[PDB]
Amino acid sequence: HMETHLTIVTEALVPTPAFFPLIDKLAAKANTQLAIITEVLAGAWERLEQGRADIVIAPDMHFRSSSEINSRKLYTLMNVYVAAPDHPIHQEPEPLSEVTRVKYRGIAVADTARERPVLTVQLLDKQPRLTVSTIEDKRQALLAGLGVATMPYPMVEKDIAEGRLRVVSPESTSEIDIIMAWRRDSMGEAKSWCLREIPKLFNG
Amino acid sequence: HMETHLTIVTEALVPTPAFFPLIDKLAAKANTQLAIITEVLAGAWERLEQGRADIVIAPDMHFRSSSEINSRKLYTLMNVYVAAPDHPIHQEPEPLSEVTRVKYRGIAVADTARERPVLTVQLLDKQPRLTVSTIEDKRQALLAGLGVATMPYPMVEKDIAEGRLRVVSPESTSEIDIIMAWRRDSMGEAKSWCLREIPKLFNG
Amino acid sequence: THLTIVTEALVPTPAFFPLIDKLAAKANTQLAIITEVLAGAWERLEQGRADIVIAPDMHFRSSSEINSRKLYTLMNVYVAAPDHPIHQEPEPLSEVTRVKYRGIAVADTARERPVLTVQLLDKQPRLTVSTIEDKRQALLAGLGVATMPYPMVEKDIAEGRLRVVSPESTSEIDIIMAWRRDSMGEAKSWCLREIPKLFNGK
Amino acid sequence: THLTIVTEALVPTPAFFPLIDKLAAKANTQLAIITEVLAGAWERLEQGRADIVIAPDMHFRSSSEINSRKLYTLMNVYVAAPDHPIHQEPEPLSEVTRVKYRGIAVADTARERPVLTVQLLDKQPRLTVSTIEDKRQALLAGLGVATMPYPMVEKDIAEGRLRVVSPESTSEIDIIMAWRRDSMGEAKSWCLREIPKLFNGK
Ligand code: NA
Ligand code: NA
Ligand code: NA
Ligand code: NA
């Protein structure tokens, strides 16, 4: 109904290309131009709170208890603690022991900058770390043997199969619920349509 | 509510400060941060069409009756053809004659800086012209004796009283309806509230 | 024909008015003195939609094809209305304090989103306006705290309508004249010579 | 203890990986190689939130105090999927034509002096993404026409997944290393010496 602009935020763990089917359909449904922006952890939620994002696709988080924010579970994602095959972490009797983990470099994706608070990986103080902005940069660092870190399984599935990466220990494997969140204090055609279409991209 | 952002566009003829009462009230009604942006003629409407403005306050225009756009008349504004007291245009028998107007410099508000003629005296081809972006710059140019142009009466009322400007000829005085316009394809709390409050600013 | 000078919002357009009559005699050139905000001024120069830009010294243009010359220095003062509570603050410039009070921004290239001067924190209230005058009126009405060009508020501070929040935040900015070297028309060349003369000793 | 290098989106972060082990031996410094887009990279430097910036050329100072050095040249190519109708176009770069086809933009963290890597026109359909990878995937999927860094699509062009729209639009950009002189830590100094060595021959 004349040109419109909707802004979807996909957190770093969420593949942006999964939302590409929406683009053509949104151009036919309305005259709506899509913006699918990437943010990291709390940065995704912050965008929603500050009213700078129509819909957020992100891991379930403590922010969700907000009264004017609706939310719905989309799918589950698996996180695996990986390292390059030749990394010494593999020869460790107790790779997840606090005494062992400090010996080896962790790799973190920043949310705004170097931020100690993280839940995916418990980086310890005095432990070496590398910090990057993108999930791809983190992958390349891991492929190059530069540290040990958690990754979304889809992004490293081929890597593990083809022996470029190796799961450090299955004990650390975690499941994260990926949720769709939005604010009820505003509504439009395009936003409503997306809220209905996005779940269809995944389960049903 | 938590933070929200609304964008009101006020066309150059419309004093932005008239919307200042909204600011404090909008901070209490919701957590909404206001942006009152100035545009010139068609630029104001273009923002509305492109979905880059929640509400537009602008002169009534050829854009109107557009199917997705609601509108409401707010008030009438008077436009006066003025020049500095010492300007030779005052000594002219026929100041508004095509033969006369070409002799003297017109002043236009634009961004494009090429095509002025829209709704009023306008600028004749081959006529000397100065182009400025703001209504204030146009006022100063007129005060400095540099040309002849239309101005919104409120902005030059004191100038005419105190003999800094002088109405060239009353024949050219025109009335413009200032309307509030928005798009129906979207709605939220703040937007709805403003659509109700803005007319109240101009009751009297 | 047609010359376009772009004066950034901080730069008073009327300072260029002396050029108008002279340019009409020197050449048959019709002048446009267009106002833009921050990056919008430079963008016009890059896109070849402005012959000369008068603007604060700033990043970009890929460091290709842009000549520049310093015209004068401008002082920027952090001001607020006399009765604004920011004045009673022990630490008015502390991040903990600044968040309490509304900032006021002039939107850049004339749009809401492009606003990255500085001084605005998350969770901080803000108002965004298009013009430096609108920002002045907002400040006069007590609606926030913001930086202003000293010349535009000098009388305001004298006559007690505004008050400098803290001198520590005062900054000096070089106002430069910039153009592209890939063209040198008659009118353009003449203006490049005349414009510095408008500001001599300043 | 903590050094922050900012690499603009056009710059491959992994090119700086050799530094990591050496920096751990040289000093006890934990490295952050952060990605930003266009002006967002510079803004970090101005706000003192980045020790070193690797980014497309600016060379211009509002914030002042900035030293810079050229590292290497990068080529940008206007590409689209092989089956995109832009290829059948007589005049693919004509303003009349470009509006017909969707542009793809990487969003910026700052005052958008660079907004269009090539040029995005009003009324023109657009998709906006945050990352250069997302933009690549969009292009691979046939969803628009946009500029890309040649190294990132060299294999794509070879293996017929992408195709250069027109060579006329190809542009060369200097990638520079920039920093502020008002500080000179051990690690920062060492990196400023090592980083140029990573791009000998380039
Ligand atoms: Na992304
Ligand atoms: Na105004
Ligand atoms: Na001006
Ligand atoms: Na990167």
Curated annotation (Swiss-Prot), chains C, D:
<dbReference type="GO" id="GO:0003700">
    <property type="term" value="F:DNA-binding transcription factor activity"/>
</dbReference>
<dbReference type="GO" id="GO:0000976">
    <property type="term" value="F:transcription cis-regulatory region binding"/>
</dbReference>
<protein>
    <recommendedName>
        <fullName>HTH-type transcriptional regulator YhaJ</fullName>
    </recommendedName>
</protein>
<keyword id="KW-0238">DNA-binding</keyword>
<comment type="function">
    <text>Positive regulator partially required for expression of genes in the locus of effacement (LEE) large pathogenicity island (PAI). Also partially responsible for expression of neighboring gene dlsT (yhaO) during late exponential growth. Binds to DNA of promoter 1 in LEE and DNA from the dlsT promoter region.</text>
</comment>
<keyword id="KW-0805">Transcription regulation</keyword>
<keyword id="KW-0010">Activator</keyword>
<keyword id="KW-0843">Virulence</keyword>
<keyword id="KW-0804">Transcription</keyword>
<comment type="similarity">
    <text>Belongs to the LysR transcriptional regulatory family.</text>
</comment>
